[PDB]
Amino acid sequence: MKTIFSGIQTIGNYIGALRQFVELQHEYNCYFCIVDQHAITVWQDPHELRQNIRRLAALYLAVGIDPTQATLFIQSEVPAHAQAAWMLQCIVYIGELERMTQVSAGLLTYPPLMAADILLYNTDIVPVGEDQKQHIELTRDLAERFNKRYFTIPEARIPKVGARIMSLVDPTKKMSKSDPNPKAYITLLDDAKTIEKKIKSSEGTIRYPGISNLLNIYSTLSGQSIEELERQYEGKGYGVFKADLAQVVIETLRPIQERYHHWMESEELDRVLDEGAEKANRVASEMVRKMEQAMGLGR
Amino acid sequence: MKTIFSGIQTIGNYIGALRQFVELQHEYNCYFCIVDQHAITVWQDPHELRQNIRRLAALYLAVGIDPTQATLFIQSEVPAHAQAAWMLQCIVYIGELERMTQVSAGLLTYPPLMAADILLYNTDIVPVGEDQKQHIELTRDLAERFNKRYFTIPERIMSLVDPTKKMSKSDPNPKAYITLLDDAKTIEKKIKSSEGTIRYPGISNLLNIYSTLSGQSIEELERQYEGKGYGVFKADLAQVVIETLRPIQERYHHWMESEELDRVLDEGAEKANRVASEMVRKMEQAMGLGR
Ligand SMILES: Nc1ncnc2c1ncn2[C@@H]1O[C@H](COP(=O)(O)O)[C@@H](O)[C@H]1O
Ligand SMILES: Nc1ncnc2c1ncn2[C@@H]1O[C@H](COP(=O)(O)O)[C@@H](O)[C@H]1O
Ligand SMILES: N[C@@H](Cc1c[nH]c2ccccc12)C(=O)O
Ligand SMILES: N[C@@H](Cc1c[nH]c2ccccc12)C(=O)O
């Protein structure tokens, strides 16, 4: 089947890409890489980083990611990423790196590492937004350059398209976990009280920026059409609508949150990660060896 | 003991650094790394590179490097180098890299890899010339920066065609230097190629090569060669050069057609891979990588 690779460092992300990944793990060969080596391109607190790595893994498992169907692993645990990244750093031009839209050198040399993350597994598709367009283009250029000289040409395509969830405080802005205003987003780990507060915070009619965003969250999470909801809330106010949407969000997160705690306090977590690295290390190790063979490294 | 690390990409070379290498491996923990990963920072022909890697290893063994005393290995065969190099790339500043006096990103990001080569083995000494001074300074700065935040702080044959330059395989004239693998015919031609007395820039250089290769003093060669021409000197020196490389070349060719070579290299990587592995793991632990 086709290979999918996702490098990971809210409800809008869940809905936007993650929630469909749980169906797609059965059709496609999915790879979920916790890019801890990319994380260190900026200041990091060792304890926090280590903790965030575990949380992310648990969250992905809690959401439905099947460790037997997909490959969930930690980047640093697969040396091939660093090995391949160096080889690619030798074929990439400084100009290409400098041109990047986005002083620690990791901030400039990380693109070749991202290309290695992808190219290492002969991935066909990469579920990324427009913010990663340039990055994907560079990895495609590097793949072509290497191929012609001595990989599958990756493609940036999120396979099952969801809604674009916007911030609760700025309806024209995409909802992001890096928002200065915590009120702008809803975390997969937020508690009932927080969800309500965040959801509760001049037309007065429920028709499809602010209201429309709420409807998208409601629709995708409830399974009801935007028209269905429009009819159901006819002549109704935002209060009840918000009180309603707040309950659906909670009902969605609660099962996820409790699975997250089991994983977080279970030994299976580390066991599952050990297997992921093994599965990944196996595919990547082979690729690195072919790369070295083509370049002339070692024996 | 103290740890020594030497990353490797003429007779002047042997006499310079490598001869004494044949000696210090017994009272020092020496590491001889064939930096093939650094080699790819510039265009390379896969077949040539692969071949050059083998040759270099054989040459180092043929010269006297004891695989049981020192650690001879190929850089790429130890993933820790690339792993540690990335972590160091994250603590180094672009400005520091740009400031380097020495185009793939690799020409600019290779210094952090060289620092990893060194720091990985807690080396105390690095046998390098002034051309690597800046590089050594950067690895010392990186070691200090990492330590404070979260390593060991590490620290003449002229040309034949130009007695004022220096003898160097990088010469466009192959007749300005002598290769350890050069044959008798070549050695003679290169050695044979107005004041007309012998004592001690061309003559002083010849006397130096003669002295260090023969074992006799420069004065010994001076009283020895009282009232002689350059003909007979050049013929004598050229013989000593052949007598020096002969045994070496014989050992070299032996290694180049034996399976013990790959056996020795496998062992080097495994002794190197074990130690570098431990360091990488401590680095990751300090930075918060993985688990
Ligand atoms: N608010 C959102 N709505 C829809 N998709 C989102 C949202 N936030 C993130 N994503 C998707 O989830 C991933 C976010 O990756 P990142 O660039 O680190 O934010 C990409 O696949 C995005 O397209
Ligand atoms: N005459 C010499 N004396 C001492 N070391 C030498 C001599 N010739 C070559 N070398 C060594 O060989 C290395 C080659 O440097 P490079 O020009 O970059 O290839 C130098 O860094 C020295 O360590
Ligand atoms: N650069 C991505 C993460 C990432 C690293 N390597 C990747 C490979 C494929 C997709 C994404 C990635 C981000 O910051 O979000
Ligand atoms: N940079 C050195 C080779 C090298 C790589 N790593 C090293 C570590 C120590 C000493 C030398 C090296 C050269 O070009 O000659």
Brief account:
Two copies of one chain form a homodimer. The first copy, chain A, is mainly alpha-helical and 299 residues long.
Explain what the structure shows.
The PDB classes it as translation. Keywords: ligand-dependent domain rearrangement, mechanistic pathway, molecular simulations, Aminoacyl-tRNA synthetase, ATP-binding, Cytoplasm, Ligase, Nucleotide-binding, Protein biosynthesis, translation. The assembly is dimeric. The entry is titled "Independent saturation of three TrpRS subsites generates a partially-assembled state similar to those observed in molecular simulations". The structure is a homodimer. Chain A has 299 residues and is mainly alpha-helical. Chain A has two domains: 1-164 and 267-299, 3-Layer(aba) Sandwich (Rossmann fold), CATH 3.40.50.620; 165-266, Tyrosyl-Transfer RNA Synthetase, CATH 1.10.240.10. Helix content of chain A is 55%, strand content 7%. The first copy, chain A, contains 14 helices and five strands. Chain A has helices at residues 11-18, 21-24, 36-39, 46-63, 80-89, 94-98, 106-109, 111-119, 133-149, 192-200, 210-222, 226-232, 238-264, 268-295; strands at residues 3-8, 29-34, 71-74, 125-126, 155-156. Chain A has a three-stranded parallel beta sheet, sandwiched between helices. Chain A has a two-stranded parallel ribbon with strand order 4-5. In chain A, helix 8 (111-119) packs across helix 9, helix 10 (192-200) runs antiparallel to helix 13 and helix 11 packs across helix 13 (238-264). The structure holds adenosine monophosphate (2 copies) and tryptophan (2 copies). One tryptophan (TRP) binds at residues 5-7, 9, 35, 38, 114, 117-118, 126, 128 of chain B.
